[PDB]
Design a binder for this molecule. Structure first.
Ligand code: MMA
Ligand code: MMA
Ligand code: MMA
Ligand code: MMA
Ligand code: CA
Ligand code: CA
Ligand code: CA
Ligand code: CA
Ligand code: MN
Ligand code: MN
Ligand code: MN
Ligand code: MN
Lengths: 233, 232, 236, 233
């Protein structure tokens, strides 16, 4: 299937498939059963920030999720992505709903990859998303243009979120994420999100992910699979 | 056909289609008959640099082509690209040969687009090109493994350039080059080239170009059309 | 010494060559702008200033926009090789006089690049400020200029009640000298961006904000409050 | 005295003050006795590259020193620089000679600091150094030339390096290296060097360092102290 490396912002505890008992941030390598998580004090209706980083020296994937004037949640996992991802990848944001629902609004998204050989660089930054955003591949229920925002999960005209939704946005350009004859390689992602819900239960979450170039939404990956994974193994 | 805005580095004077009597740099808007040129003191076998720039305020497309420790050649043309290019474009390098040949080697290529609305940004930079460069669309005789270099025109194993060759590389991502509800829009391209020839006559040149997304090499655009244009 | 500036002039001083309306202007070695443009200044709304110049076009351009309003633009063709010293400092100035306004800077970005003729490589400086701390050690504050109040740079005196004060001058310069041009340069570009909030109780707000490039050792000239925007000694 | 955090490129083994028996790269925190080293295959007369990085998430200072077409040497040390450096610092390159001599030529120097609270950022990049480089504070025998290079140690008119030399260049601007109300803070330094010597013994090395703003060359910091430290404690 697809090869997926992802940082999950999991809003629904699915303790059946190895989630903790609370909303968490987690690093998923080839599986939705995170290789490390951390308690996340998710704030319904407030605009949060995700910072993802990795470099070829430390070989450690790290993430930080803050709200302004609250303590950040952090998670790190040591992983050689040379042994996990293909040389050439695409980068994306995924989200999902199931029985429970939430808005999965992305307000901004930045990414930077650098690769000094034995530098090549890509950088994109989105603070506005247009009705036809030709440098984005939208999959599933994903839309651009409403208030200049990327809405990853289905939302009605009245701004009310929908259940059993999966949706992704991938940067159109392939990315050279690692090279054999490389001395240093870094990448860095940043996105802002707004997750609103009517219910005491919001579900199911947003992820930043790196996949094989041709990656598509796996079948029935709505809900607890965050549109990333086919099964819950 | 394709909509083409380009900065030509023309090494062969084709005075029949409006070239000056000397190697020149020129700004082509929807035509190979440049809207302004400037004398270019092209150096066979030396590594040169091209800088292209434009912004929504000045609305002026400018180019500089230098060799280290030589006087630069410059050309500018005032053009509102809102009235010329589509909102969404691709960026690329083209080159060509005809009766006469040159190596059209690209050693580096950088591009930056910015767009502050009523900022979004793209940046790529290439100093090495790999055997399979998946963020480049190579058209025509264009190759990337070489020696870390983009070779836009056919070159044999002994490093000798070939005649009647056309070849392009476009950045895979579409680029948002202008917007109606924009306050400022900038772009900037930079490439290094090495143009070598055995002959006194090298031909026919390299261009940086911005086109419609689906742009392909027009038919028999070898030689004086630099792989950009169908006719003159 | 030498001032090159983009003025955001909120008070028409028609005696020293201002138009009859609030304007944006390019001042070279004088407060009598070399070109202006009508500016529809919005009291209490957050605007944006974009300044740009390059060694090829040799044209200094500015855009001042308010969200969902027309941009005002001004350009002037000038070779800054013949005007500024090789090495400069960059800054924001503001002032008040009879009429007053808040001269609040909420963000300030600057980028200089300088690709050389000898070598292939570029020299570059970049700073970006979105927050300003109580002690901002990479800023030289002159006059009534302060940092820390809501993480903003307040260029003119503002009392405890948040009410702006008259007869105030104040500047902030980036601590590092900037190499703005070189003889053996092929291209040289610079770009400044700042957000401002200009609020006033009066129908008359005064007197304005400028981005400026000066000699390194530049200080607030004597009685440059009011119409001289803390940039110029006399109104010549 | 001065507070010094540095990445040493040590070319002379001073085993009496805790150097390994070979040329090494090391991470020095408030002392010339490195907190971690690594064997460095120093190449006399070839142009090398130093890459330093650190971030507030991992809190790990990492360095890589390569030559073209040779294996890089790497060193990392986990350190919270919040507990070590002052909030505001200056950045610099130091070098030295003693009994033995080497050219300590810097051909390029780049630095980038970021600080998300919007983000504050500084970036400078030098590929050419002018006769009067007004954004650099040169201390000791440090010069900038019409060869376009920063020469940290005394070099005669014969292109021949001199003994008992100390010399530093600090970026003129203070740098905000950390903040209490920060979510992420990163920095990254890169410099190219050429270290040439007539002898089999070259000495004594180059460092990238972060210090207190008002930092000056300590007394008798020639030779094995690399112009960084007063004593060898
Ligand atoms: C009871 O679990 C269901 O609802 C949750 C909440 O959305 C989903 O995560 C999950 O996939 C199921 O559809
Ligand atoms: C005789 O002219 C031919 O050869 C030159 C040299 O390339 C081309 O420019 C031109 O288009 C023709 O093909
Ligand atoms: C009547 O003019 C006075 O007030 C205006 C308003 O600021 C100033 O510009 C000027 O210097 C004078 O002090
Ligand atoms: C005996 O060692 C001396 O020479 C070496 C070589 O430079 C220096 O490192 C050291 O400080 C002393 O001056
Ligand atoms: Ca879950
Ligand atoms: Ca021609
Ligand atoms: Ca005035
Ligand atoms: Ca030593
Ligand atoms: Mn989970
Ligand atoms: Mn021509
Ligand atoms: Mn005026
Ligand atoms: Mn040592």
């Amino acid at each position: 299937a697809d090869t997926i490396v992802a940082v999950e912002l999991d809003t629904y505890p699915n303790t059946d498939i190895g989630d903790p008992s609370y909303p968490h941030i987690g690093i998923d390598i080839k599986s939705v059963r995170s290789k490390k998580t951390a308690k996340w004090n998710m704030q319904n209706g407030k605009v949060g920030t995700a910072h993802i980083i990795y470099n070829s020296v430390d070989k450690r994937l790290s993430a930080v999720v803050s709200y302004p004037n609250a303590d950040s949640a952090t998670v790190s996992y040591d992983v050689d992505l040379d042994n996990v991802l293909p040389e050439w990848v695409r980068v994306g944001l995924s989200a999902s709903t199931g029985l429970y629902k939430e808005t999965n609004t992305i307000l901004s998204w930045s990414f930077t990859s650098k690769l000094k050989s034995n530098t090549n660089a890509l950088h994109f930054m989105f603070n506005q998303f247009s009705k036809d955003q030709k440098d984005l591949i939208l999959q599933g229920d994903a839309t651009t243009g409403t208030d200049g925002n990327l809405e990853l999960t289905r939302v009605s005209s009245n701004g009310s979120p929908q259940g059993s939704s999966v949706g992704r946005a991938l940067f159109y350009a392939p990315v050279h994420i690692w090279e054999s004859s490389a001395v240093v390689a870094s990448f860095e992602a940043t996105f802002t999100f707004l997750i609103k819900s009517p219910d005491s239960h919001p579900a199911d979450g947003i992820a930043f992910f790196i996949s094989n170039i041709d990656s598509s939404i796996p079948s029935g990956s709505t809900g607890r699979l965050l549109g990333l994974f086919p099964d819950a193994n």
